[PDB]
Scaffold this active site. Structure first.
Site, PDB file in Angstrom:
ATOM      1  N   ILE A  74      10.812   0.642  -1.628  1.00 46.67           N
ATOM      2  CA  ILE A  74      12.067   0.803  -2.070  1.00 46.67           C
ATOM      3  C   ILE A  74      12.422  -0.282  -2.849  1.00 46.67           C
ATOM      4  CG2 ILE A  74      14.404  -0.065  -1.828  1.00 46.67           C
ATOM      5  CD1 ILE A  74      13.731   2.451   0.267  1.00 46.67           C
ATOM      6  N   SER A 116       9.731   1.604   9.229  1.00 46.66           N
ATOM      7  CA  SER A 116       8.843   2.156   7.900  1.00 46.66           C
ATOM      8  C   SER A 116       8.469   3.494   7.325  1.00 46.66           C
ATOM      9  CB  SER A 116       7.956   1.390   8.176  1.00 46.66           C
ATOM     10  OG  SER A 116       6.829   1.309   6.018  1.00 46.66           O
ATOM     11  N   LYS A 167       4.927  -1.571  12.590  1.00 43.38           N
ATOM     12  CA  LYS A 167       5.766  -0.483  12.483  1.00 43.38           C
ATOM     13  C   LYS A 167       5.490   0.907  13.797  1.00 43.38           C
ATOM     14  CE  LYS A 167       7.190  -3.006   9.204  1.00 43.38           C
ATOM     15  NZ  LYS A 167       8.643  -3.753   8.883  1.00 43.38           N
ATOM     16  N   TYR A 207      -0.324  -4.243   9.430  1.00 44.11           N
ATOM     17  CA  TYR A 207       1.072  -3.695   8.841  1.00 44.11           C
ATOM     18  C   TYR A 207       0.999  -2.485   9.351  1.00 44.11           C
ATOM     19  CZ  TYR A 207       5.136  -2.141   6.389  1.00 44.11           C
ATOM     20  OH  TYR A 207       6.784  -1.564   5.643  1.00 44.11           O
ATOM     21  N   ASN A 255      15.119  -7.498  10.982  1.00 43.98           N
ATOM     22  CA  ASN A 255      14.248  -7.065   9.608  1.00 43.98           C
ATOM     23  C   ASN A 255      13.149  -7.635   8.605  1.00 43.98           C
ATOM     24  OD1 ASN A 255      14.639  -5.463   6.641  1.00 43.98           O
ATOM     25  ND2 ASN A 255      14.309  -7.630   6.090  1.00 43.98           N
TER      26      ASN A 255
END
Lengths: 255, 255, 255, 255
Positions: free
Chosen positions: A177, A132, A149, A145, A80
């Site tokens: 989230i 993601s 992912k 980013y 994670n």
């Protein structure tokens, strides 16, 4: 709950806060033996913690040997730990761009690489990678980013294919989230005023068909499912926890 | 052909052989001014060449700066330079694994990062990234490779979203193509017998619905299309040139 | 252009207007022998027209026999004829819901079913099905429309797999395109005032990364490419012509 | 298990055998009040049954109306009833082709259309549609089937988008599962020899990374998860239960 997770040894990286913490807390509730691998102290927590830099292969290996010899096995690894910063490929420094790849990708590769030899000695070990919704639909100025992912998806499939049927490997693809990071994202856009930040988060929530952003516990539910025997024939996929975000075109229609 | 490509400056990385060479030659045939950026000399070729290691950002930048000063602009960049080595995550050294990511992903990031500023100074510039069918369906013991190809899709979407509508960015996802790399991949399995190699290649060919492996010129056709104005409303996607491989389930049915 | 399309017999359904018409006009420009199969008269047109109801299997078969015996062959079939109406699964009548499926799906199945036996007698025949970006990201209250567009993808893959390598079959997935239908869609939302309709269409355009809606000719470019020998190793896929719509998450980031 | 499912009214179509029966039995084990809607009697079963042909909208509506009056509500609807016949688009009669679409797609549309109005009267209702791995990777000579399964994905997204956040709708995409239909599919290829059939099934099993075909209870686990509150932020997606089938390219690599 999933009774098979009881007493199982579960490693969660980057679990001192947000999603990673909700995941650690869910496994504790399932009666598992949880160990958080992260650089920050989770402080008061119902689970174990080991100071570890996921980008440091020597630290990762050592932390995994400590867990295995202390616990006797490793059944689940939840990768994670991650990060994000914004900028066009032109402005963001190369160092910052590589760093995002190092944490979001190489950190998963390191933890997986050293844990796998121990996991396959257990019965039906499972690995869950947090990716993601951006492994599909992306945001602007998030080059590093977004790339990391997508890369996580590739690593997940290959681990799934290389080690099936002994070990399964899946990913969870969350959309917006309610986490401190998402709070920071809003702030970097609307300032430190916590009420404007709330209007911002609300705007994002309304872009999701579910009309709200997700809760960390909802991501943890998907992770617990994929790690259990209930997902015995599930491997190499990403379970999207996005309130419908990835299937929605931003085009209005007559009402 | 695509007439709008004539006289435009086109940079192709890793164009000394295989798919890269076929891409450079197609652009030459379109009347474009082509420059190959690779570590190997393409020998007697109609396109220009600059010795350049794509994992060296300083050499990449210098090469691109030089091209812009010498030619006056850059309209198309084709990121193709790549490598492949095999091995389980547990057996492949971390160095080799990382080296695959360096060439396959960072090489695309470097070339793109330095060419873009110049490209947006031309009319409707375009970038085409060569990914792989393995951005969807993958092979065993190819962890680093598969990971890098998924990452390329992420980088492609990001660039497309970050610079639209000024510049377009798409990828091509080739399945098995007749190149030296592929012949070598077969040799690594069956030896140097041109007869046994042709057999292995014919085996792979029969796995594709088209019943043959692709030709480099077929990948080049897709690249030229995406780089041209015939694709003016196409951006952020991967055009699969896989002879149907990615839509075929290997499960027999009555017949 | 694609010189191989010259003199080839091309059938386009629903080509009396919009996208279908731009497609027919592109093939005429490529020197092909074009025949429009539709219920409406295209009036003054550079291509042939045959009154035909795509949902009428007897009419479809007869029109295809007329074309084959009159022209000597059929190399390309572009299935385009379609329609759309809005409503929740609860309010829209079952008759209207089935009708949308009948035109958008069964019409493709009928034309394909009867044309294929003639096409495979030609060298490298090609079929192109017009689907939609909604085969991926969808709009609200468009149940029947969205379902039919997903179904078209399935029909495309199966035709591609059943007839490879003799015949290829691909789909084009357009997002918002400047057509009379899209004009009607806007109107059904903002009224008959053509200026408000323009502000509406503009809003949709700005949702696309390209910052504008697409032009029919841009969809025709993709269709011509897929129908030509330039796409010789391309089959079973959908080429998205969406200005980046399907890869964009509607979530803002710091600028 | 998922405690929130206890005492809730769950309707499952085609639950007299195979996957459908396994789904009904799992919900019974969860403590749910289960009703099977199928044309065949499941014999001695713990769940309730109502004779119902899903292609008959009048019988579907009547059956659902009756369930609501008798039980007081409907919280979950699992659309599973389906059939499969084989044949090239040119050989399968139009009637049979259409009949596959009628059962596989319209049956889901009818059950959903009539249950929804009642479902939104309960707390967090959920619908789960059984699609197939063939919504992505497909088999030969299964045109109608493949088309219907892609269509189901479209219907699923639509329902999810049209009724969020009140009601969720997701699909399950199973690869090869041990059911009567599958055993029959094998028999159609190898005969009634339980030894030769087991061989054919073992062949299909080895095509999946998990090296075996799935079990009905494994599909049922995914259905229960998606129908439960453990999936409260999951909607519009397909959970693949394919043992890794959809991410495997059938191309060998050195080892």
């Amino acid at each position: 709950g999933f009774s098979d997770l009881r007493d199982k040894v579960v490693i969660v990286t980057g679990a001192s806060m947000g999603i990673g913490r909700a995941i650690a807390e869910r496994f504790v509730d399932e009666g598992s033996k949880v160990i958080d691998l992260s650089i920050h102290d989770p402080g008061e927590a119902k689970y174990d913690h080991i100071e570890c830099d996921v980008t440091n292969p020597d630290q990762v290996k050592a932390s995994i040997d400590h867990i295995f010899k202390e616990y006797g096995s490793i059944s689940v690894l939840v990768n994670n730990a991650g990060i994000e910063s914004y900028g066009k490929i032109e402005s963001m420094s190369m160092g910052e761009w590589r760093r995002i790849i190092d944490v979001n990708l190489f950190g998963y590769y390191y933890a997986s690489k050293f844990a796998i030899p121990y996991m396959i000695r257990s019965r039906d070990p499972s690995i869950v990678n947090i990716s993601s919704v951006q492994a599909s639909i992306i945001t602007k100025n998030a080059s590093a980013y977004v790339t990391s992912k997508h890369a996580v998806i590739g690593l997940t499939k290959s681990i799934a294919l290389d080690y099936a049927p002994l070990l399964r490997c899946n990913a969870v693809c969350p959309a917006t989230i309610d986490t401190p990071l998402v709070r920071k994202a809003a702030e970097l856009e609307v300032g430190s005023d916590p009420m404007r930040i709330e209007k911002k988060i609300s705007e994002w929530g309304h872009e999701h068909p579910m009309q709200r952003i997700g809760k960390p516990q909802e991501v943890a539910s998907a992770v617990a499912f994929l790690a259990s025997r209930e997902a015995s024939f599930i491997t190499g996929t990403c379970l999207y926890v996005d309130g419908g975000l990835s299937i929605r075109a931003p085009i209005s229609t007559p009402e």
